[PDB]
């Protein structure tokens, strides 16, 4: 589920990623924290790819 | 069936209550048994106080009882730290310790810190070895003064400060108590919607 969420975040479907993670992890507050840290690893991957 | 004027009553007697009825015929026997245990414990622990270790002053919570104080479970770690008593040592010398309690205000902390210090002066400490005393109370102090202190140790009493009569000033006569309460309630009730509106106009103007 963390992989599909990252796929949605990569197409910039942030709303869809949040609605997906909420169904999987449960609460809205747990969903934001998860989505946020998955954004960081995607951002981390972009930096590594650039370098 | 109701008859004429009466109260509508709903007695809670629809279960097998007769099977669970606690009678109190052993109440005199229970009181005797508790008394003998108290006396037996006091003889065993003499000359230590019969009631038990000293308890702190605490203020009862809620608006119904915050005007009264009572005995707490035990002295907080901050109170013992200020008084200079190690938390492990406090139990042996008859001081109750409650690590859960936290001191929100300094008035309560100083009240119990003073209580601990005044207790420490009143304490007579027998040496572990009667022949050899190190830092214990004086032989004379132990020989005569030591006796079992009955009743709570340093009972916690509600102290009321007397306020002498005085001339009423002009300001006090002009103070509107009713309007101060009525406006204070409205200020608290409308504080948020006022912060919203005042903020809302801020970006409206800017």
């Amino acid at each position: 589920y963390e992989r599909r969420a990252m796929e949605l975040l990569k197409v910039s479907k942030d709303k869809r990623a949040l609605k997906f993670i909420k169904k999987r992890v449960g609460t809205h507050i747990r969903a934001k924290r998860k989505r946020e840290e998955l954004s960081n690893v995607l951002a981390a991957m972009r930096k590594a790819a650039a370098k | 069936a109701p008859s004429r004027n009466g109260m509508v009553l709903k007695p809670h007697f629809h279960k097998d209550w007769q099977r669970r009825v606690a009678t109190w015929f052993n109440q005199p026997a229970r009181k005797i048994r508790r008394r003998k245990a108290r006396q037996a414990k006091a003889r065993r622990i003499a000359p230590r106080p019969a009631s038990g270790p000293i308890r702190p002053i605490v203020r009862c919570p809620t608006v119904r009882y915050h005007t009264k104080v009572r005995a707490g479970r035990g002295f907080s770690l901050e109170e013992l730290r200020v008084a200079g008593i190690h938390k492990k040592v406090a139990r042996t010398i008859g001081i109750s310790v409650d690590p859960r309690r936290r001191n929100k205000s300094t008035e309560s902390l100083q009240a119990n810190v003073q209580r601990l210090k005044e207790y420490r002066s009143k304490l007579i400490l027998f040496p572990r070895k009667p022949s050899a005393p190190k830092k214990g109370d004086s032989s004379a102090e132990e020989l005569k003064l030591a006796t079992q202190l009955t009743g709570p140790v340093m009972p916690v009493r509600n102290v009321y400060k007397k306020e002498k009569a005085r001339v009423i000033t002009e300001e006090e006569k002009n103070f509107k108590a009713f309007a101060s309460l009525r406006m204070a309630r409205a200020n608290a009730r409308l504080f948020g919607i006022r912060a919203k509106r005042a903020k809302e106009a801020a970006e409206q103007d800017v």
Binding site: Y1 | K15, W17, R20, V21, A22, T23, W24, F25, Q27
Partner: protein, 203 residues
Amino acid sequence: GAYKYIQELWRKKQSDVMRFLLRVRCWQYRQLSALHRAPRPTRPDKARRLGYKAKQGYVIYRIRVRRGGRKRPVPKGATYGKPVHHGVNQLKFARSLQSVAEERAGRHCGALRVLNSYWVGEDSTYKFFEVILIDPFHKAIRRNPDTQWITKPVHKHREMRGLTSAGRKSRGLGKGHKFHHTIGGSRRAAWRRRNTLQLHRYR
């Protein structure tokens, strides 16, 4: 140390590494008997945090329990009552399958004391638990003051009286507004106190 990593790895149960290990283990456990003594704890980290020690007198038993609810065992689904009590399916047991697993291990080994149990795998029909058992008469157990408590007779069949971690979870114990049902020690204790008519001598 190593245990912290094993603890973190076991939290990643849908990772590729752990998905493989759980599946291959669950297949293996499905090929054994319902009650089977394990040579050693499958999860050394989880075992020792639950009370296990690598010393003689501690044993592990793997228990397999069927998953699902509790069908009402009435003949032909007839309950002979009012419609409120006509339910036969969609009924749930009051205790957990982990509690049932401890009860099975405890009943089989009546000479041992159930300490705790932990999950090790599941499939559609079975859940696998590893119960830590202690032999209360081994000298390594009786001569250790930290474990001398389990040797006392009051701790006989803790799993059958709801005193293990898994067992006590179903009792409704706890502190606070939520756990008012069991003020006094148990739901039965609270009910007795609240339904007992206190008739004093002077009324």
